[PDB]
Amino acid sequence: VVYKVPEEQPPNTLIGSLAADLYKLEVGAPYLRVDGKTGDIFTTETSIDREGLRECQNQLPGDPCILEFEVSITDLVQNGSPRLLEGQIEVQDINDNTPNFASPVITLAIPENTNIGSLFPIPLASDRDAGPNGVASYELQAGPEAQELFGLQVAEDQEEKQPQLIVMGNLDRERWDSYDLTIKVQDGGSPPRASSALLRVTVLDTNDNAPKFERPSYEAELSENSPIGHSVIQVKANDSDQGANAEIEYTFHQAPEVVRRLLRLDRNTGLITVQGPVDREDLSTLRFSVLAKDRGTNPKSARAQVVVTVKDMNDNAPTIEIRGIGLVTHQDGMANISEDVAEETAVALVQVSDRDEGENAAVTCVVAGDVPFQLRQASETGSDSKKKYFLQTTTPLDYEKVKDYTIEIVAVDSGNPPLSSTNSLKVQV
Amino acid sequence: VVYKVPEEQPPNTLIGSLAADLYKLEVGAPYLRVDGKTGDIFTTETSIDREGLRECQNQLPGDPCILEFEVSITDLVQNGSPRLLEGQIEVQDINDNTPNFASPVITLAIPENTNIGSLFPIPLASDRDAGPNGVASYELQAGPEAQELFGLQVAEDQEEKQPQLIVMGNLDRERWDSYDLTIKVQDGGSPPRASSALLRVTVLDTNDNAPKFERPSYEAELSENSPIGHSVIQVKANDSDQGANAEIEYTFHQAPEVVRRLLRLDRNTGLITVQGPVDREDLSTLRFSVLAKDRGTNPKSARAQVVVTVKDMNDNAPTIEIRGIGLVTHQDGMANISEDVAEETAVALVQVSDRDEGENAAVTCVVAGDVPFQLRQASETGSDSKKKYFLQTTTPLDYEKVKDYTIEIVAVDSGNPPLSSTNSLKVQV
Ligand SMILES: *[C@@H]1O[C@H](CO)[C@@H](O)[C@H](O)[C@H]1NC(C)=O
Ligand SMILES: *[C@@H]1O[C@H](CO)[C@@H](O)[C@H](O)[C@H]1NC(C)=O
Ligand SMILES: *[C@H]1O[C@H](CO)[C@@H](O)[C@H](O)[C@@H]1O
Ligand SMILES: *[C@H]1O[C@H](CO)[C@@H](O)[C@H](O)[C@@H]1O
Ligand SMILES: [Ca+2]
Ligand SMILES: [Ca+2]
Ligand SMILES: [Ca+2]
Ligand SMILES: [Ca+2]
Ligand SMILES: [Ca+2]
Ligand SMILES: [Ca+2]
Ligand SMILES: [Ca+2]
Ligand SMILES: [Ca+2]
Ligand SMILES: [Ca+2]
Ligand SMILES: [Ca+2]
Ligand SMILES: [Ca+2]
Ligand SMILES: [Ca+2]
Ligand SMILES: [Ca+2]
Ligand SMILES: [Ca+2]
Ligand SMILES: [Ca+2]
Ligand SMILES: [Ca+2]
Ligand SMILES: [Ca+2]
Ligand SMILES: [Ca+2]
């Protein structure tokens, strides 16, 4: 015979009697009591916990929880041998357990710019109770800002409710990177029972941002013949992402070889320095681009024009080019004349040249000996390096005191320290 | 005095004469010739290359390229000393050089799902010529499919044309991962000159795809008490991305500790195996989820329900519970009766139980001795393990041949190999 008893009733609640017919309890011992000569059976000071009983442990949904008990009728006119009877009390569930999350703080990581509608699962609540007394609903309590951004959805697919976050609008990590929601679970008892957990959405970073240089363009003066390791310039860029999506590498972009030889760009600090012989007379400007690149898996990159102006040093000593004109013409640094046609006639054309810049290539230019020849402007302009002078005569002269004219010229630039050159010519006669 | 001469003319082209006034060439030597008594000056079998001349090398845009030359008038009624004159021939540019890319194949990497409008720079073409004879336009020749996807844009920002790819629609790597375009550069000469390069767009992979399991759900039978390392089941998932965006890791998701003890999930292969004592009498089903996760920087993940049915083994030997009923009641495995009231009266209630399943818990149940007691059904149902029998009398008996009743019961299950138990009772008298 069967019986329906609510679980966890108070001691000595009567569960019933003889819809059949001394009575003894043979089995059911801790949880029940019977009375002699009545066969009315009541609960004990050990309450029946539907959730406690080994008898009811792994039972599948809606498989009824039955406690076995046996009682003996051992009187039939004190002649019969006793009659036991199989009993079954079906313990009925009450909402005496609260729905729960495994941890009271729950922590989702959602990437930046997840498309609208994207779903993410929330951990399930559980409830040791059965049927409508177990998990019933989920509710998403949220700050205003956050409410426009996040929704809740529940699936009846898996015959057990999987609650899910819907992303309702765009997330940007850079804008804001941490939200706070509470997820309320509730059961379907009366009264119901509920529980909460803090659901923290963490916005994860994507490499959605490129490097930018402090300045679009870069300029720097650099002194010619500087030593190996002299700081030319530091370029630096900026990335609004996080970690390696924002770590930066610097490398030459549109840089011809010459420059590559002379400069060293350091990838971490972005400090260009000298690594080679720098000569303004070779290359007066250094023009190149520089490439800033993040360490994202798909690297984003920027570039900046750099132009280095090479500053002059007086490292070039002037140059006295002596040469012929018209019919007069030199040979291994000496020429011919005799019984000169006139004074103020020209023996040589003389060009003085300096390869540096401004002052350091401004040339003064002087005839050494005691001879009868001067330099006279031939040019009709004032080009400060490119002097063209005639080497012309001062006094007439005859074949008797001649063939002994070593005219030597000297030149100095207005540099500091100054540099000088000397160059000569013999006139035979 | 000045002069305009086109570069790379044929030998002995006349560049002009005396808009002034023997004539000698003093400077300009390799590239020019003058004629005596005329002062008309013409080109040589060394052509003037505007692009060749050291004199014109690093010249900034539109800085004119001038070749210096000096000539001497050394006749003024054969009385004057000679007059030289500064010359300047301004060499004029002709479109004798073709616009070029550094490499003839160019190779851009664009990420999946780059937003429409996103720009990417193409390497610049160069042109050793000057002014309108240098780079003029860029043109993007393209296959139909590819044309809907990619545009060209040129910037006049940097005073030098930076050509750029515009992305015109969505790229999906999984769909198609390599395009072919040609980029045509052309100059602004007449006729113009042009050049091409193969521009290959490579679509780079983003982790835009989650794992999926072969099957939504997984089932497996597993024999109780199997050995450590026995293959239970292999779960496997699938990711349509590339590299580590598609490499997969398997780990238990909603798995209570018990299960964690008994099973070992291997992260690479996704093969669950035995790692602990499995007892159907402890846990008949193993229910858990499994988590597949890619090795993307922001891992995407799937999960699958797994349910393992534990199959029974005859590892439990039956259980003979002897106990009292009504007034008759046992004590350290023996009880009292004397001058029995009748035969077919019951001394004990006897329950035989096996903890296994089906056959291996089907019990036959037999009284050993030569005694006057049998087992008789007390229950009113056929529960195949839970037998309830009376141990009742066969023959009457008196106090003179008694107090020597060791009734022993034996039980065996229908398992293979079968298991047996024996249990006894003394009746004093
Ligand atoms: C570099 O980046 C910051 C943002 O991190 C920006 O506000 C700043 O103006 C940039 N440059 C300097 C000189 O701080
Ligand atoms: C796993 O992935 C492939 C695509 O790579 C899919 O077409 C296939 O059907 C999946 N499963 C099996 C059993 O091949
Ligand atoms: C070049 O030579 C002159 C002497 O002729 C010096 O004055 C000058 O400093 C340098 O030695
Ligand atoms: C239990 O004991 C019995 C003998 O009483 C055997 O038949 C059985 O196989 C097991 O040993
Ligand atoms: Ca309870
Ligand atoms: Ca309950
Ligand atoms: Ca509940
Ligand atoms: Ca962002
Ligand atoms: Ca970045
Ligand atoms: Ca970011
Ligand atoms: Ca130098
Ligand atoms: Ca210098
Ligand atoms: Ca100098
Ligand atoms: Ca040329
Ligand atoms: Ca040209
Ligand atoms: Ca050209
Ligand atoms: Ca894709
Ligand atoms: Ca993936
Ligand atoms: Ca992909
Ligand atoms: Ca077992
Ligand atoms: Ca078993
Ligand atoms: Ca058994």
Residue numbers in the entry:
A (entry chain A), B (entry chain A): 3 to 23, 32 to 439
Quote what the paper states about this structure:
Protocadherin-1 (PCDH1) is a non-clustered δ1 protocadherin involved in respiratory diseases. PCDH1 has seven EC repeats (labeled EC1 to EC7 from N to C-terminus), a single pass transmembrane domain and a cytoplasmic domain with the three conserved motifs (CM1–CM3) typical of the δ1 subgroup. PCDH1 may bind bronchial epithelial cells and epithelial cells of the airway mucosa together by mediating homophilic adhesion and helping in forming the epithelial barrier. Here we use bead aggregation assays to show that repeats EC1 to EC4 form the minimal adhesive unit for human (Homo sapiens [hs]) PCDH1, despite its longer extracellular domain with seven EC repeats.
The third one, PCDH1 EC1-4mc at 3.15 Å, was obtained using protein produced by mammalian cells. The PCDH1 EC1-4mc structure had regions in which electron density could only be explained by the presence of glycosylation. Residues N89, N248, and N346 are predicted to be N-linked glycosylation sites and sugars can be observed at N248 in the PCDH1 EC1-4mc structure. C-linked glycosylation has been predicted for W186 but is not observed in our structure, while O-linked glycosylation has not been predicted but it is observed at S430. The observed O-linked glycosylated residue S430 is also near the PCDH1-I2 interface. However, sugars observed at N248 and S430 did not interfere with this interface in the crystal. We could not detect structural differences caused by glycosylation, and thus the role of these glycosylation sites in PCDH1 function remains unclear. An additional calcium ion near the EC2–EC3 linker is unique, it is at a crystal contact, and it might be present due to purification and crystallization conditions with high calcium. The PCDH1 EC1-4mc structure does not have this additional calcium ion.
